[PDB]
């Protein structure tokens, strides 16, 4: 199977999506129309697409919520992450905010308890150059 991140609303350039999926017998022209048809409701957002291809030259795709990395950036108020995480601090997040993002990405998190969901978020935060404030 193949997983990737395409921009909602635009799918057609040969260089990126062309070979990656084409090497698996994926009909690029049918994929682009399909993806651009459903994800038109959220045009402008970057999201992961799971495309299941089989022996038959047909496929199916599933849409997923935006990655935590993107949420943390928009939460802290930054467009670009830090080149050097524990070297250059760019943004900061508060405890209650960590819970907020954790609760939103909980249904897709591999954690069982909320405490575990909070910590996984904190992990990405410190590795992205975001200071955690209580």
């Amino acid at each position: 199977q193949i997983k990737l991140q395409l921009p909602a609303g635009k799918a057609t350039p040969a260089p990126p999506v062309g070979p990656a999926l084409g090497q698996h017998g994926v009909n690029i022209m049918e994929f682009c129309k399909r993806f651009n048809a459903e994800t038109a409701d959220k045009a402008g957002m970057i999201l992961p697409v799971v495309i299941t291809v089989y022996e038959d030259k047909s496929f199916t795709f599933i849409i997923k919520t935006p990655p935590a990395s993107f949420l943390l950036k928009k939460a802290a108020g930054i467009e670009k992450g830090s080149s050097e995480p524990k070297r250059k601090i760019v943004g900061k997040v508060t405890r209650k905010q960590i819970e907020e993002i954790a609760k939103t990405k909980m249904p897709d998190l591999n954690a069982n308890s909320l405490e575990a969901a909070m910590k996984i978020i904190e992990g990405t935060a410190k590795s992205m150059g975001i200071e955690v404030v209580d």
Partner: peptide
């Protein structure tokens, strides 16, 4: 070496649809 749509330079890439 001789494909259709598929790389950034050598010489083909894509072109149908």
């Amino acid at each position: 070496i001789a494909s259709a749509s598929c790389t950034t330079x050598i010489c083909t890439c894509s072109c149908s649809s």
